[PDB]
Write an enzyme that holds these catalytic residues in place. Structure first.
Site, PDB file in Angstrom:
ATOM      1  N   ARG A   1       0.829  -1.196   0.000  1.00 26.77           N
ATOM      2  CA  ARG A   1       0.000   0.000   0.000  1.00 26.77           C
ATOM      3  C   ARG A   1       0.868   1.253   0.000  1.00 26.77           C
ATOM      4  O   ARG A   1       1.988   1.266   0.527  1.00 26.77           O
ATOM      5  CB  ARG A   1      -0.949   0.034   1.217  1.00 26.77           C
ATOM      6  CG  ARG A   1      -1.897  -1.161   1.319  1.00 26.77           C
ATOM      7  CD  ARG A   1      -3.266  -0.846   0.713  1.00 26.77           C
ATOM      8  NE  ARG A   1      -4.029  -2.045   0.359  1.00 26.77           N
ATOM      9  CZ  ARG A   1      -5.083  -2.043  -0.456  1.00 26.77           C
ATOM     10  NH1 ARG A   1      -5.495  -0.902  -0.996  1.00 26.77           N
ATOM     11  NH2 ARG A   1      -5.725  -3.174  -0.735  1.00 26.77           N
TER      12      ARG A   1
ATOM     13  N   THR B   1     -13.961 -10.597 -10.623  1.00 28.33           N
ATOM     14  CA  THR B   1     -13.451  -9.231 -10.720  1.00 28.33           C
ATOM     15  C   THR B   1     -13.871  -8.542 -12.005  1.00 28.33           C
ATOM     16  O   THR B   1     -13.473  -8.941 -13.106  1.00 28.33           O
ATOM     17  CB  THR B   1     -11.925  -9.197 -10.544  1.00 28.33           C
ATOM     18  OG1 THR B   1     -11.597  -9.648  -9.217  1.00 28.33           O
ATOM     19  CG2 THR B   1     -11.399  -7.790 -10.707  1.00 28.33           C
TER      20      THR B   1
END
Ligand SMILES: [K+]
Lengths: 518, 512, 503, 514
Positions: free
Chosen positions: D107, D311
């Site tokens: 991240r 997805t």
């Protein structure tokens, strides 16, 4: 090996699936043609030059919008961008030009302060649909104007009206002299001049309008190669297009667009008289339930494959790339699966007409198509195309299946064919060889039109005929080979199959020979 | 016509169900017929009948007869064959094959004698014993027999009708109990199954016979009792460099030859399933297994395979065969044999031309009943990728012929090889092979569905003209022989320059 | 490796052929039934016992020859040989008895005489030939061929055709007494039946014959006429129509629909149509019977030379094997068992060839095509059957054990040509004998009176199928077995399939 | 006609395509399970009831975001909605709960602020913990220290699910000097991908272990394990699940190049597979994802193990009421590929049309399932499957074969662990597999198997086992009639065993529904 060769060798389809490899790299020769719609984002000569380098093969002119001079200039810009590569004749790429007709469209009107104004049709609202020219510039949250006067006579009480690619929905409640009173079923926001769909209603608009004849005659007189005929419902709709083009337009390919339930059910009679098909999923997914379009797509592509005629898959293939530089996972899946379905061409609409990444969209379609073409299970496809094709006594078709069977035997890099009109190349293309079909022609229009046939790479030969005919034939074959080496199709050591005829003129292809590239 | 509803079928079961006895075979007969020359089939005038009946190869059986006898056979066959050369458009080449004696074992010496079941029998090799063998003593012309068959082993005499069980290795012979009695003539053949025979793979008599075949120009050698690859080398050595053009067909006749089949087939020009000896050497109920296996592998290899022995046996004495004999012929054709053979039916029987006629008629019906759909698919899928332009043209030509049900594929060939490469994909269309080589014209009778044409005129001044008059020669012979009609499609296969090895062109043409 | 399993698992037919192995030994259980004709060579009780042990399953009474009491003595000897093994319930092999009707037979009269080619002969000695068919002078036009003695003898009628047909020997030869006559290409009038055939059929009903081979069947009416003449007690007797001429082949579909099964009678058929085309008729008929699920019998001259020779020819061994490979349910010996010197040896030969040939069947493709061609069905017996054959192929089960009353449960398994033996356990003595017509079924005659609770009477018959199978070498301690039963007594309710380990 | 059976009976695949008919309605119930990701748009009991009614079979808890108590709340609302339908046992639809681990994520730092990265601006990637909170238009901080030494000059760093790209200009002491390739609005703590880089992060972080033990103590049925690279990773998940987590199904997410090339060893130790197309389409060229999808669905179908496609199936429906043509085509083609499950992520976690997205997947899956070319599929699955001596698999293939022969409406099977239901599902019957079980967890987990419809049986056992067996069969029949799988006069195949307890399935019967 490369080009998914282990998955091509497979016992069964299941085991073919299990052996597909992301590391196996494909051939440079992408065989599904890319159709790009011209618009604001793709109109400049320099932009067009980059779209030819990325792989665009057919430029689409959408006559739903624009004047005759607007389209005349885009024809000019395209031809200027194309001929810019003509200086190196071993790399020159023909680019075809298609005219997509407007057809029996129905549109809303301009609203309150036209420019960019928006109105939300609230669910549960009452809204009136009006055909009175007073209300033509009168759009608001309770009134919509349409350009279809007879709409008040073909939409019964309880009939559903769709607006803006089917995102808005109305249901008629009463008919009156003021128009049709509707309760909004599905709300949303409404711009100006949006398309309207009346599935099930018996729209009485002619399949060929007065302006459509004008548009067709324009294309004849500016030399278009292909007509995409919108909203074709029956064999007589193709005839009208043929008549409209007249004797001077006899050489122009008519792709019928299948866009509604009638066109799907009357499919066989439409294919019989058309040169090819477009599966027009935009209108189609409003006219029939959206969860059924893929059935319609897979059926028509199957039947076009069987008949040997080009089939185009179109609309929202890379829709998000209007706004984003990368497509969604569903969008790459969709392009791959249309190539695996057997489509000859894939299309971009807004992605090249008005989005911010038109060259990237073409690039994306090119890259997906190369991988998908390698992953076709040619073993079962060829065997089934053989059995389903009827016996024939035309030497062109006989030579053609011979050459494709020969190409699979030596894993030939290409099949070089000489053709006047493209027909010899199309007959090769319909058995779906893995080898590239490299079509050498003197016909500029034929070079352009063969882009509709999957796996045909046109080369425009222009040197003047030689004294002896057999020497002219050999020279064009040598032109095929050296163009092919220059473009990466061929390498020294390859085998190639070469297809020719026994006398000048079209219709006499009957010779096939096996040549090693030195 | 031609059982094509059955050829059209989606499944083999549907294909069987659609076979029709009232569908006449349009195609010419594609499986070659071999006939053995003997007293019933030596006169020039009988041979002429047999040629017209359909004999394609004449087999000289070198197990019997002097060299002068076989020279007489050769001269008579050639006289009857050239009897038709005056009309070159219809002249049928006929190959001559030499079948070697081999490592034969025979007993000693109209006259008879019975050996009683359960009798005690002596096997000895002594030279003066050779003259008088009795119901208790059999002499064989193989001395090492006394070393090769241990206790419990079996000795077969006279086409396997008589057997013996050895109980002890004695000092002056082998003490045996008769397992199967029978009445034994003089000098009949002996088989030793499950025995390690050290007899040479090529005897000095066989070497004299192969030199004879070279001197007299035989086209084909059927090599008896081939056990391993080195047996083919001994044959190829005896033929010498002068005999390099002669095709060697290896006879598989015993268990070892079956076990070493792949290594034998690879050094040979093809194979003969010799069911006579082979059905003595292994249990009789296993021969069909060996036959279908070997026909299968030869088919995969694109090499000729011959099915031989007792196919029409009863026609030695009767004018009509049995039901088992007719289905045997048909089923050998269905298996994929390139050739079927007659031995005693033509060498010594009372109906030699009738038997040839029976095989020809059975072959025609059975070739039409072949399930071409699954066969061509499996053959092209089994055949590996090739960069040889002759093989690439061949399969392209065969695929084109199936697409337009061409009557014929006309090929130009010097060694026969281009015809053979078309043959291995089993076209339904006839392969008409035009060649100047008289020998190659005879040898491609080994390949199923090849019809040779011997072109006799000298080379035209312009090569391209020479090719085209050969092609037209193929068309004119075809029309005379009933292969081609006006309006038919034919596929024509040629090369881009003279000399063998350059076949690479395929054209579609309409007759006339 | 055994049972040609490499060739069975091949991905293509050509590969299957290439992998066949002379060294791969087959299963002990042969699935094609052997039909032996009874005659002087095969009539003694001692001999018949030997033929049963050599593997005879169906004994054929040829009513073309002999008298009614002659045939009743054969039946008694057959049954005495059969019932001599009835003290052994686990190894007892039912043997069916089949009545082959005389039918529309034309025969000559009464020693030996030669008929020179080109001679003038009359059909009413060397120039005279008597015939037992009165209407022959009415149905053979001039120029029409008359064949005698297995078609070896040719005759063409001269323009004279009044009191006897004046003929010309078209192919000469040697003529015995009472030898067959064939009239092809000429349309005939002789009745479908006869008074002898009716009474022969009735004699069959009286002596309890299981099967009727109906000679010269060319129409559904013939089979109805046969079933009519068999009478109200004649139901339960399987009717095999013998296809023997051009008419019966091209009207095959209407005959097979009416019949229980088919016999390809190549003897007469090879006279009536060109000999070259018999193999076509054979393969066409076996395929269509296979597609229909109905037994087909291949017959005549299969091991002909073994009448006088101890060893068959190479074509004869080939022909037996190819009949089995084609899909024949049964194969027949005629003169080889009825009048030859090697009747037991000929049965042993057929038994040995059939075991080899059954292993060499390309089962993988055969099963697929039989599935695709068999239609959809809501009959639970048919649904349970194809489930069980599919289950059998997955675990290579040694056998499918099935409880059946009429045999129909066993026949429906048999039509999918499973590799595993179908062991059919029945109380119906006649059904046990009739299922020999269906390839792969091994009938067991259960003799115990019924248990009190039906669910224990079901388990007991199932175990009787196991114990028998182990004793005979069909099953052994590691084998998996499929058991097919029903949800209630009485026939017609088969609907259960279980997978069991044979302890 | 119905169910596309004219296309089902065609003798070639090409002919089967030509015969597909838009007017042919699907009458088989929907066999591909729908997985919905929980989030703000789908956490109310009211919306969860509507999503169960529209077709949701599995609820996915995404542990990439949200605290343990946040996920306990989701679990509790999901169970409240599911048991809102208990009390009608014949129509009660089990719903499985699946835990999607965080995995080795990377991240960016903290900046509700937003910063614009402009095309061709020069940006610095720093690991320096001082800069953990000092990100702006030209410096990005990442929680992965070794990123300085694994990205070479010219390598690529993707931020924002591949939206933003960074080509490394230069590597130095302060960090990686880079330039924007494609710019976009960069939020705080966004995801980063390193295509063609060596990331040595452990398969199982400490919080992942904490999350897995949370799922065991809250009784989740399924674990979707993020970024599985090797068999070793699956063993670590199973180890962290503990002895109480014995019966939890482990679905390995294939997310990068290595998991694709180590797929077989991952498949052998996993209960099943998810094609995780979001990460996967960043880690490998986007043009190659369909290849990996089709390869992986094929191998799982071959192995008989569940496979999930995921997805962006209906991504535009996050803001629009109707999907695009590409999206409907994508869902249809995943079902045609052979996927056992299809998934919704933002469509149901956060979008504005969660219920409609479920409805759309249900309607597409039903049309696609009927368009499966069953003739070649069943044939190839038969011959490809190995010989077996397990009687449960012998019965399964016999029962699937019998079902096709009578066009049975259903195969009713009794199962304790779900295994016998799964062994039928792997042969892809067209008939519904109605699985009656007392195990409520097994009832939830067999939603992983295409074509299995779990019924939870709740009555206490009967004294005589035969009676207990048959009333369970009768429960399936009556449940089937109430739901529409079954009708008077249909045929059904019933699959049962010879002894109580799991593993003893061996009986197949054909019976008429009355
Ligand atoms: K338009």
């Amino acid at each position: 090996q490369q080009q998914q060769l282990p998955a091509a060798m497979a016992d069964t389809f299941l085991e073919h699936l299990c052996l597909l490899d992301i590391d196996s790299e494909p051939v440079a020769a992408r065989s599904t043609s890319i159709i790009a719609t011209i618009g604001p984002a793709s109109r400049s000569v320099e932009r067009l030059k980059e779209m030819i380098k990325a792989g665009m093969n057919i430029a689409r002119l959408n006559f739903s919008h624009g004047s005759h001079e607007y389209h005349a200039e885009s024809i000019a810009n395209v031809r200027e961008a194309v001929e810019s590569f003509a200086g190196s004749p071993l790399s020159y790429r023909p680019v075809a030009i298609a005219l997509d007709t407007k057809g029996p469209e129905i549109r809303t009107g301009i609203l309150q302060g036209g420019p960019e104004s928006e109105v939300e049709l609230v669910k549960g609202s009452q809204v009136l649909v009006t055909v009175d020219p007073a209300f033509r510039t009168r759009g608001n949250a309770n009134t919509v104007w349409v350009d279809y006067p007879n709409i008040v006579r073909v939409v019964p009480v309880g009939g559903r009206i769709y607006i803006d690619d089917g995102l808005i929905s109305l249901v008629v409640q009463k008919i009156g002299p003021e128009g049709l009173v509707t309760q909004v079923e599905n709300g949303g926001v409404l711009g100006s001049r949006k398309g309207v769909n009346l599935p099930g209603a018996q729209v009485d608009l002619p399949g060929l309008s007065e302006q459509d004849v004008r548009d067709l005659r324009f294309g004849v007189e500016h030399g278009v190669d292909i007509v995409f005929a919108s909203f074709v419902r029956k064999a007589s709709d193709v005839a009208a297009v043929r008549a409209a083009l007249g004797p001077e337009g006899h050489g122009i390919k008519i792709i019928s667009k299948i866009e509604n339930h009638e066109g799907v059910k009357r499919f066989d009679e439409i294919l019989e008289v058309s040169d090819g098909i477009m599966v027009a999923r935009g209108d189609l997914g409003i006219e029939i339930p959206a969860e059924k379009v893929f059935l319609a797509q897979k059926m028509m592509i199957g039947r076009c494959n069987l008949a040997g005629k080009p089939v185009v898959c179109a609309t929202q293939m890379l829709e998000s790339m209007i706004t984003k530089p990368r497509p969604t996972r569903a969008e790459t899946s969709d392009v791959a699966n249309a190539v695996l379905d057997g489509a000859d061409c894939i299309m971009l609409s807004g992605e090249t007409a008005k989005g911010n990444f038109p060259v990237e969209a073409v690039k994306m379609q090119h890259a997906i198509a190369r991988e998908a073409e390698a992953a076709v299970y040619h073993r079962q496809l060829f065997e089934e195309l053989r059995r389903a094709a009827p016996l024939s006594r035309d030497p062109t078709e006989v030579t053609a299946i011979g050459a494709v069977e020969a190409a699979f035997k030596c894993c030939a890099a290409a099949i070089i064919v000489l053709t006047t009109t493209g027909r010899s190349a199309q007959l090769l293309s319909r058995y779906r060889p893995r080898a590239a079909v490299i079509a050498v022609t003197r016909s500029a229009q034929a070079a352009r039109q063969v882009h509709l046939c999957r796996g045909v790479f046109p080369l425009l030969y222009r040197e003047p005929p030689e004294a002896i005919w057999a020497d002219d034939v050999d020279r064009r074959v040598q032109f095929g080979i050296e163009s092919g080496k220059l473009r990466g199709f061929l390498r020294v050591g390859d085998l190639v199959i070469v297809v020719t005829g026994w006398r000048p003129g079209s219709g006499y292809t009957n010779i096939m020979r096996v040549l090693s590239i030195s």
